[PDB]
C-alpha cells in the first residue's frame, strides 16, 4: 500500500506542505519518496530503540502513541493507526508541526543524504498539483 509520486504530491498541495513554514512540496516528496518509497505502512526500526513508521517516518516512541512502544511521549499527540489507513493526514498533520518546530527538511534522514542535492522542483515536474 505505497503512495504514487504525484498521487502523494497532490495531498501534499491540499495539506498545505506546499512552501509552509518549512518548505515546499518537493522537499516532502523528495524526502518521503526515499524516507519509505511512499510506504504508508514502512516502518523502520533503528537501534537508537525507536521507529519510523510512516511515509514520514513517524516515530510512534517519540510523537504518535501507538502503544505498542513504553515511553511514549505523544508530543505530536497523533493516532499512528489513523495515519496508516492511506492516509497521510495524520502523518502530515505530526511533520507540519515537525517542520515548524525547527526541522525543515533536516529531521529526515532520506532527504539529507539522497536528496540533499539534487531538484525536488523536479521531482514534481509534470505532476497533477
Given at each position: ?34 524516507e519509505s ?5 514502512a516502518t523502520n526500526r533503528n537501534?537508537?530503540?525507536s521507529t519510523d513508521y510512516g511515509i514520514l517516518q513517524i516515530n510512534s516512541r517519540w ?45 529526515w534522514v532520506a ?19
Amino acid at each position: 500500500k505505497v503512495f504514487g509520486r504525484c498521487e502523494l504530491a497532490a495531498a501534499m498541495k491540499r495539506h498545505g506542505l506546499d512552501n509552509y513554514r518549512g518548505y515546499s512540496l518537493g522537499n516532502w516528496v523528495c524526502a518521503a519518496k526515499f524516507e519509505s518509497n511512499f510506504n504508508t505502512q514502512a516502518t523502520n526500526r533503528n537501534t537508537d530503540g525507536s521507529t519510523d513508521y510512516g511515509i514520514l517516518q513517524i516515530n510512534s516512541r517519540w510523537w504518535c502513541n501507538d502503544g505498542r512502544t513504553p515511553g511514549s511521549r505523544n508530543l505530536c499527540n497523533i493516532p499512528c493507526s489513523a495515519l496508516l489507513s492511506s492516509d497521510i493526514t495524520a502523518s502530515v498533520n505530526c511533520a507540519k508541526k515537525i517542520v515548524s518546530d525547527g526541522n525543515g527538511m533536516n529531521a529526515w534522514v532520506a532527504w539529507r543524504n539522497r536528496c540533499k542535492g539534487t531538484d525536488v522542483q523536479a521531482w514534481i515536474r509534470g505532476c497533477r498539483l
